Amino acid sequence: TTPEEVLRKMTATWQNELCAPCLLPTQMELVEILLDQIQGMEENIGKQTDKMQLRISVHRVELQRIGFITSDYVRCRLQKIESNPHDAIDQHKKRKEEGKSDLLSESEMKFAEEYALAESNLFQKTVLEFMPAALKKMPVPRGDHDDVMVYAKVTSDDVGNVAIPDWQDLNGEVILEMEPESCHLIPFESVHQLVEDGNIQLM
Amino acid sequence: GGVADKALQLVLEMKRNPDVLPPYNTELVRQCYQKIDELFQKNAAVVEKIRAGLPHDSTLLQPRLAAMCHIRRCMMAYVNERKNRIRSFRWKYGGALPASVRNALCDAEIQFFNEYSSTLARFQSNLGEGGVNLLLHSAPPKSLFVQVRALEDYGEFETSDGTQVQLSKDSLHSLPRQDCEMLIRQGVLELVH
Amino acid sequence: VHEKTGPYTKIPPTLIATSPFLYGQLLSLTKSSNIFAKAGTKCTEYELKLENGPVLPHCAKMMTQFIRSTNMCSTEEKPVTMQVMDRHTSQGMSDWTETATNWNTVTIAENCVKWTKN
Amino acid sequence: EHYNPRNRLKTQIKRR
Amino acid sequence: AQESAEDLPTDLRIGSKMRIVSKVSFPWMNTRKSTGNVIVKFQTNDRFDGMQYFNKTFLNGYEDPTVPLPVSPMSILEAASLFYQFPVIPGLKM
Amino acid sequence: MNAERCEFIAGNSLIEVIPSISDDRPIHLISGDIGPFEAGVPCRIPVWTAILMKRKHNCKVVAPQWMDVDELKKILTSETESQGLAKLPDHFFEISHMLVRDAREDIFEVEAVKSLVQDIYDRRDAKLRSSAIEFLRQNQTCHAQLDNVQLIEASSARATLEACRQMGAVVRNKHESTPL
Amino acid sequence: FEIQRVESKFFDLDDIIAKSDSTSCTFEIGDLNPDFFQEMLGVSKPTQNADGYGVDAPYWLLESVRSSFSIQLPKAYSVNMQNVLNADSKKLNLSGLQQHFYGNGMQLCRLMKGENPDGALSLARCLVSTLTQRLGEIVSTATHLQSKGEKFDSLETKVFLEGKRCKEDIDTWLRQDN
Amino acid sequence: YPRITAEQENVSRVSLAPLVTSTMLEQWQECYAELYSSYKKGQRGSFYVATAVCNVLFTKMPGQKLVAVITHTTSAIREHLRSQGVDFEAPQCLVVHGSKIHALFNALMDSDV
């Protein structure tokens, strides 16, 4: 695998992470590779004696672009974790029980636990210590992404069929076919698995 | 008035005032504590009559419980809205609270700000070898160098290539963007168009 | 009862029976079916639909026999369920006797048939 | 010697 | 709560639609396990035999509960889905 | 997702330039080698690199083949005749705006090219407006097909997503209110 | 340190304000302790007729009443108004009637399901028709620079604000290229 | 009935929308296939068809031999059936037996005439 391939995968990951309403499986491996590449190029430029020439400016502008992509990805994921930290831990544990790929990396999980404790302290000092003994439990809201729509484009050849709710009869469901160049306005939970597998690009 | 008229005024107090955080309303929060406790004591007396097998009236138990839960929901919503207002300040300008904001807080909120800032810095330190400042690269980069005007006598400054610059009041500079983005955030420099 | 204004202008009421009569036309419901699969589980689901006409009371009785004849109940730990819709427009037709019942959703096994208290 | 990103990636693959 | 019997209880209210859901495949479906739509495909004399069984059940003007069954269960499926109607217009729902 | 990030993604496309400087080795970018440069001999580089050289007077930009006036007229003819959205080159509007912003000296028949691009944008905008208005009268489905939509066109039209999410709640309330 | 799972809109100020509204209702005489009207509502004596005690009560309290009670529809949801809104709602000022129109309607349907299923279904059909008549006008109105969204409901305000945000972004990007 | 255009009174004027005629055609295409299928491979004895330029009977002779009979033909009709590939005995009437009945079934289903 080349760094030229790693950067191309990272850009598609960044676009999907911005568009999706909830948390995708983590891709901090590519982030770590690209940060190491930035540091290597910086030290290599630092060994040069002459810097007022075209090559150094071209290299520095490319490092600017890669730094923007990685920073914006990490900022989006932290802003998603801050909205509901306990639910993120719960979903990560459920994916581990199902035997699927990781939702959070180790540092992300550590951040989530420490933020959850820091958020609990404020409520306990302000309200919950004054409550009667039955009312001292900490509230945690349920998930909220039930009726969210997305614009989605199909890229893979053999995606197959998708099921969506039936607004004429909400007891049942309707089946759709996804031909391999199409764009759709569709609920997110129908295309969730294909977005994880990389067969669909969100717009 | 009604049983829950105190609780709605916290919600209206936060709803009427976007952005600029009002001072903390300890007294109204305290009155809400006392009203919840009074409803609990009434239901406890009815519970003890039921346990003793005495004559009792069971009809008001669920209305009193509903009133208690509604007041608790209002109080925690007030605290949560103020918490979001506080947490926004770590990303505006440099990561610090103004004095006019700090005078409006209580001590628990100030403690929460310090805990959150320490947690965020500890997370930032683990990215790569040297850590990453996430206040940098806040938008897609347009160019390498920026043109800036210096607003105060900051004195001597040095770029990442080791070139010295003498930032003094009412002077114009052309500098790399990454090096002076922090000073633009902290209000020492302004962009020149 | 004879609509003089609308989409059913001068069209007389509908008559329905389960034994032939003069001018009666023989007709059949529309049938279709689907396969659903999800989440890598064992639970693939198989769906059958009957639409575009009245679903008369004999239909459910014969469909029970279709299921029990084709032995879909053999793992009774995995039941089969049936649902009939829009019966509230004809509410009251089963109240006049002890031989009838109101039901909306039904579970079939070989040993029994079950419904909610409703 | 002329620097190249691929050698840096091979070195990091050996490290991790 | 739950209520139960050996056999299906009668309901006399006419409805507009029937849906049946199973975890076991239907006979015409057995090739496939992927998500998709499937035609209810009939074979040989099954429809005609179901029509025979239907008319024989209701020949007296009321139901005879003692008629022998057909051999193909597809004919039972067909016999369940038939009725007589008047008036007749093609292309208008009645 | 917004228009600045759309332009950022559009910057990764390749375009052909003619240098006036010269250089001996290649340039080993993390996105792959681009050099060497010889004066007066064309070669292909990324769009961001091309604009960076053009600002420093180090090259001349060669416009894409779809900026020919005949090709633009073909695109306008197909867009007029088709009922849905016609197919376009990748990042069509973004690359057009970037090149008119930074390199309009090198475009040929500039005003005619500019007017044709504005015509194409106007009637594609009208098609998207009519499709969204006709969708929001629906109650029977929650699905639509929008083939050959561009990324910036999708980015400008995110109110429909929020409107559909609001409609679904009232539909679900009616279904739960239906008696049994 | 114990966790209680709650509603997804537990902290929403708009939802709390929507729960805080009150509707006109009637309770059976003697089936409830008359301490209730002073204890919960702060009213010294109930107003009384042949049908029962007649009062107004809030929605959060009305969900807790497992006893018998009855509901009268408010002015904005009365049947004549239902016919008017179902006939044409494309240009009406819903905010003048109620700032939480669709939310209070959905609460009324959930309460009225046990008393009056036909009336509940009729009101639900009216709500679906009313929103379908207005969503396209909202999404179109967001594109004008002089629009200020005076007449819209709190539910409709979200769609309006998102549309105006998108219009501002694309206009700012276009006006760089002069 | 009767359909054959030489034998008609002034039959009453009728006009119908495209929807009714198209849906009626789809129903006819199903119904004709059901009658022919039950007749060929089941116990159904016989049935009749009437049409604007012809008249057809399907029957069986007393595990049996299938027979089709056409009446009241013309030179153009007989030539057109041979152009459709229905090849037949010709004793004006016509007779077809056996496997060759399937071609007549297809010709009746498909043909423009």
Author numbering:
A (entry chain D): 22 to 224
B (entry chain A): 9 to 201
C (entry chain F): 477 to 594
D (entry chain H): 4 to 19
E (entry chain F): 145 to 238
F (entry chain B): 1 to 180
G (entry chain C): 4 to 181
H (entry chain G): 239 to 300, 323 to 351, 455 to 476
Manuscript text:
The association of DNSN-1 with the CMG helicase was then analyzed by cryo-electron microscopy (EM), in the presence of replication fork DNA as well as a complex of TIM-1 and TIPN-1 that was included to stabilize association of CMG with DNA. The resulting structure, which was determined using cryo-EM density maps with average nominal resolutions of 2.6 Å – 3.8 Å (FSC = 0.143 criterion), confirmed the existence of a DNSN-1 homodimer that associates with the GINS and MCM-3 components of the helicase. Specifically, the folded domain of one protomer of the DNSN-1 dimer forms a large interface on the amino terminal (forward-facing) side of the MCM-2-7 motor of the CMG helicase. In this way, extensive interactions with the PSF-2, PSF-3 and SLD-5 subunits of GINS serve to position the DNSN-1 dimer on CMG, together with further interactions with the MCM-3 amino terminal domain (Figure 7C (i), NTD, N terminal domain). In addition to the folded domains of the DNSN-1 dimer, cryo-EM density corresponding to an α-helix is observed at two other positions within the complex. Firstly, one α-helix is bound to a distant region of GINS beside the N-terminus of SLD-5, where it contacts SLD-5 and PSF-2. Aided by an AlphaFold-Multimer prediction, the amino terminus of DNSN-1 (residues 4-19) can be unambiguously modelled into this density (Figure 7C (ii), Figure S13A-D). The interaction of DNSN-1 with the MCM-3 AAA+ domain and the MCM-3 NTD, in addition to multiple GINS subunits, likely explains the greater affinity of DNSN-1 for CMG compared to isolated GINS.
The key regulated step during initiation is the assembly at multiple replication origins of the DNA helicase known as CMG (CDC45-MCM2-7-GINS), around which the replisome assembles. CMG unwinds the parental DNA duplex at a replication fork and associates stably with the DNA template until neighboring forks converge during DNA replication termination. Here we show that the Caenorhabditis elegans protein DNSN-1 is essential for replication initiation and acts together with MUS-101 during CMG helicase assembly. Our data indicate that DNSN-1 binds simultaneously to GINS and to the MCM-3 subunit of MCM-2-7 double hexamers, thereby positioning GINS in a precise fashion to promote CMG assembly.
